Design a protein around this ligand. Structure first.
Ligand code: HEM
Ligand code: HEM
Ligand SMILES: C[C@H](O)[C@H](O)[C@H]1CNc2nc(N)[nH]c(=O)c2N1
Ligand SMILES: C[C@H](O)[C@H](O)[C@H]1CNc2nc(N)[nH]c(=O)c2N1
Ligand SMILES: N=C(NCCC[C@H](N)C(=O)O)N[N+](=O)[O-]
Ligand SMILES: N=C(NCCC[C@H](N)C(=O)O)N[N+](=O)[O-]
Ligand SMILES: [Zn+2]
Lengths: 407, 410
């Protein structure tokens, strides 16, 4: 059944058929919509594997070819024998690029095809993992000129030899609970910062302490490693008109690199697949800096702006929020570190979406996540109806490693 | 069954059971979610169960479920339906229905006020002039010299779908929109189509930037008629900025009373096609959407320019900067002219407390996240960090085709 999507700002209407190939289930029903909920075998493997291969070969204009059929046969025999199979290089690259392409929560998918894939499937140890990761961080940072990339470690086998990167991101600041009862650093990482301490990490106890990597290979216990400081590009935050901003003492890292997700390609599961691209301003400025549960810096910045914080109707929070995001962008740009603002990012996504509609006949998109956390309606995506559904290959969430590992 | 909802800013988790009483569809399937989609004559037979459901709820709420008063009413209603195909609601039921339609509106963030709603029974109305008189009284009462009071006027329910009462305006008070051969739009672009119809029907437009539109009223299914609202009844607020003295020179102003008038109210199966309702504005409705939407007044560039902001590159966030000031101004003005209004911060905080209270006393509170979260400063309002469950409960306010696309002219 054809579905239509209307942009209420331009009246442009797109027709979606791509949803017809929807695999998994959204979490919604005809009776209830859970759109805003953050998270709603051989017989199983071969079918999934087939869907993927038919998909790949169709993309390379060889659907049905002998190569297509051969490969399809080879995998079956391989699955029937090894109860699993291995992706050829080409299928891995395609799989990862397409997992990104299908990421309904990513606003920067217009860059999906320019992804650098690092095949880390030959890795066997944590040090090996550290080595691959460092090279990933270095290649991707490129001295400020960020380049998207993903490193894929060995796929899951029996589930007891899983490769995992316990960190939620390759680079994040430590969080510590203090005497007062308050929290120093990033509250979002308190638990992990603890797991690292208990493991031996000599935590510095600072506001912005770059966490160590906790790498798990072949189901073994995780090991700690310190990313070469020379490899962690950071931007000191200063304002273009408030010379007092520098006194806030804020700084953030330039490389966003989600590393706790699971990559699925043709039925196979890669539980260690850190990936990186570059920041959209609001991610840091609005969410990391201003979320009540994160660095919660709104009051401070307000004060120094000398504005009436007596009543909410003065919109002092909104006032401050804007200046703060001005500074993040300003800084990154001043130090020549790649970064994109919500206006450019969202406009780009709209274009990508239009391309995706005429070239794929659709584009899965999660409105709740696509629309920036600030100035929502003044960005194009706000007025754009979206259809959300799941397509594989995909990036999925997965239980925290510490919540299920057998030490 | 039980469905959990979590607030990622407090870790507070709520359990929903109310969704079980959900009857209608959502547009969402098990394979596809359409949460961001704007808008995805009954038989005498299908009517009784609906009436029953509604009545069982009414009586349950007044704590007389199963009583003789309850039983006889069902008997009375079923009888009436069979013999007349329809049925009339008792005043008490109508007031209960209206309050609950509001109580169930998943796109409304001001529901903490649902219980305090003034219901005006206009069911004895038979003509447009009569509807005009009724609306005038609604506007005067609700406005209350700037101290707004929520209220709704309910005109005769649908019968055969041929004698429908309709308020052609989308809001009782709204500014006209005119398209110039130039291609530009004068006034409110959103009301261009309706404006043309008014002119075609006989209205003589002042052709200005903020012309209060005339009421186009349809009674008992007859052709719509024009009426101008008594100017002394239309409260307006000129918009000025607390610190930007040039703001007042932007020539901006807006009306104080928001009153959607094109929705359909459904109570116990009964359909009320003319049910204008009003409460008070949340600042962002005017400051963000009405003033800054590209397809509305679109004042950003001008407010930006006059603020002398670097508009050479979006990354300077001049748009975001201007937007705040403009919303600063809408709020300030209303407060200065003592006209009720609430900012998005207060409004969303209150809604969270309302929502929590609703989970504890009702077992849920259907909410549309896409609509509840404000069009600016999204994540610095609690609703953003709040998971919500959207589902439909009756009584309800529904959308309905524009009268001009269905009306059989006489
Ligand atoms: C090149 C620049 C990129 C930009 C500017 C971009 C931007 C974004 C933004 C703003 C989010 C929301 C983040 C949050 O709220 O936590 C996001 C989420 C996401 N992006 Fe992208 N992205 C980019 C590259 C990538 C890459 C390289 C991949 C994969 C190969 C990817 C996969 C995803 C996924 C899986 C999510 C959702 C993660 C989650 O659920 O927490 N993105 N992206
Ligand atoms: C006391 C003042 C009230 C406030 C501050 C409030 C606020 C809001 C806001 C911000 C919206 C979204 C508007 C938009 O984006 O166009 C809305 C929607 C809604 N409200 Fe309320 N509301 C209030 C009173 C009422 C009343 C009295 C009723 C009904 C009796 C009601 C029924 C609804 C409905 C049905 C919608 C959705 C309308 C649509 O789909 O366009 N509200 N409300
Ligand atoms: C409860 C709600 O789902 C939650 O706050 C979502 C909303 N939208 C979001 N959007 C993005 N990009 N990132 C997030 O973490 C969230 N959080
Ligand atoms: C396409 C999208 O559904 C649309 O822009 C919605 C988003 N949220 C909204 N929220 C409110 N309150 N009002 C609106 O008009 C909208 N528009
Ligand atoms: N932009 C990206 N964001 C991933 C999550 C980062 C998180 N919001 C934060 O630290 O703010 N990914 N990427 O570009 O690969
Ligand atoms: N607040 C209310 N809003 C109704 C819609 C008004 C519209 N967004 C606008 O004119 O901006 N309802 N109410 O209070 O009854
Ligand atoms: Zn849904």
């Amino acid at each position: 059944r054809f579905l239509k999507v209307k942009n209420w700002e331009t009246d442009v209407v797109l027709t979606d058929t791509l949803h017809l190939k929807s695999t998994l289930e959204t979490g919604c029903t005809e009776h209830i919509c859970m759109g805003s909920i953050m998270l709603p075998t051989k017989d199983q493997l071969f079918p999934l594997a087939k869907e993927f291969l038919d998909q790949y070969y169709s993309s390379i204009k060889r659907f049905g070819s002998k190569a297509h059929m051969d490969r399809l046969e080879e995998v079956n025999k391989e699955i029937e024998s090894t109860s699993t199979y291995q992706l050829k290089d080409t299928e891995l690259i395609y799989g990862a690029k397409h997992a990104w392409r299908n990421a309904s929560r990513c606003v920067g998918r217009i860059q999906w095809s320019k992804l650098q894939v690092f095949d880390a499937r030959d890795c066997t140890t944590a040090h090996g993992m550290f080595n691959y990761i460092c090279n990933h961080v270095k290649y991707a940072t490129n001295k400020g000129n960020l380049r998207s990339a993903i490193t894929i470690f060995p796929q899951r086998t029996d589930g007891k030899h899983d490769f995992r990167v316990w960190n939620s991101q390759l680079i994040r600041y430590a969080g510590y609970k203090q005497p007062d009862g308050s929290t120093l650093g990033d509250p979002a990482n308190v638990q992990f910062t603890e797991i690292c301490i208990q493991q031996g990490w000599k935590a510095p106890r600072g506001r912005f302490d770059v966490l160590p990597l906790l790498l798990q290979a072949n189901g073994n216990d995780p090991e700690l490693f310190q990313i070469p400081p020379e490899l962690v590009l950071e931007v000191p935050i200063r304002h273009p008109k408030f010379d007092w901003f520098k006194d806030l003492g804020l700084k953030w890292y330039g490389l966003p690199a989600v590393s706790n997700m699971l990559l699925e390609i043709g039925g196979l599961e890669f539980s260690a697949c850190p990936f990186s691209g570059w920041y959209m301003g609001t991610e840091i400025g609005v969410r990391d800096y201003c979320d009540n549960s994160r660095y919660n810096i709104l009051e401070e910045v307000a004060k120094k702006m000398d504005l009436d914080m007596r009543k909410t109707s003065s919109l002092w929070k909104d006032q401050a929020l804007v200046e703060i995001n001005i500074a993040v962008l300003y800084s990154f740009q001043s130090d020549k570190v790649t970064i994109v603002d919500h206006h450019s990012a969202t406009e780009s996504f709209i274009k990508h979406m239009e391309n995706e509609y005429r070239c794929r006949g659709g584009c899965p998109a999660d409105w709740v996540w696509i629309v920036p956390p600030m100035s929502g309606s003044i960005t194009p995506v706000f007025h754009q109806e979206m259809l959300n559904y799941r397509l594989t290959p995909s990036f999925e969430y997965q239980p925290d490693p510490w919540n299920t590992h057998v030490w």
